[PDB]
Amino acid sequence: SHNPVVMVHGIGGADYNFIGIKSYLQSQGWTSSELYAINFIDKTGNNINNAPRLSEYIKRVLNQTGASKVDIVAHSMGGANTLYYIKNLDGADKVGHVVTLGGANRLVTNTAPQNDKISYTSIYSTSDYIVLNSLSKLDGANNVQISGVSHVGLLFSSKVNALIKDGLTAS
Ligand SMILES: [Cl-]
Numbered sequence: 001s002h003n004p005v006v007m008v009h010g011i012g013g014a015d016y017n018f019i020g021i022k023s024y025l026q027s028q029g030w031t032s033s034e035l036y037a038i039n040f041i042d043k044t045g046n047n048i049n050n051a052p053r054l055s056e057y058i059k060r061v062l063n064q065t066g067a068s069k070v071d072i073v074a075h076s077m078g079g080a081n082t083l084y085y086i087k088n089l090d091g092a093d094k095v096g097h098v099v100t101l102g103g104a105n106r107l108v109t110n111t112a113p114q115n116d117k118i119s120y121t122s123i124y125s126t127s128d129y130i131v132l133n134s135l136s137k138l139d140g141a142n143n144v145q146i147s148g149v150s151h152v153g154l155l156f157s158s159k160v161n162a163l164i165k166d167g168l169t170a171s
Contacts, residue, residue, distance in 0.1 A: 079103020
């Protein structure tokens with residue numbers, strides 16, 4: 001069955017940003033009670049606070065469920081928080097699949113960490129006016145470029161939803 005999914009919002013974001021994606025994954029066979037969206041109290045996106053918070057949240061998810069790994073879907077600065085956690089903290093042995101949506105990924109690294117053991121997908125839109133695609137493209141990820149969708153639109157797009165499902169089941 002699927003790993004628990006942890007969804008990670010960006011600057012000025014919230015857990016409820018992921019309501020569309022949760023409803024989609026539930027319709028595709030994921031269990032609602034194994035879809036987790038963190039709510040950062042720090043809305044500035046600061047890796048210093050949010051990456052350890054993410055680490056602790058995932059450990060609680062692993063401890064509560066008994067799963068060995070989580071998958072992550074991250075939006076915007078949430079992608080940077082996620083890559084900081086994997087690269088600089090403890091996340092490299094805790095994650096199966098990582099899917100970023102307009103992620104501000106190269107603020108942390110140009111290369112997806114341990115991308116032979118962790119499966120990475122980076123989805124981004126040429127109409128994104130908040131995060132440039134050059135920031136989202138990640139060496140060692142499946143980089144998927146689409147058109148016509150806005151930065152927040154990435155959270156409420158049927159095309160993106162299908163790409164997320166592919167990213168969460170990549171081999
Ligand atoms: Cl935009």
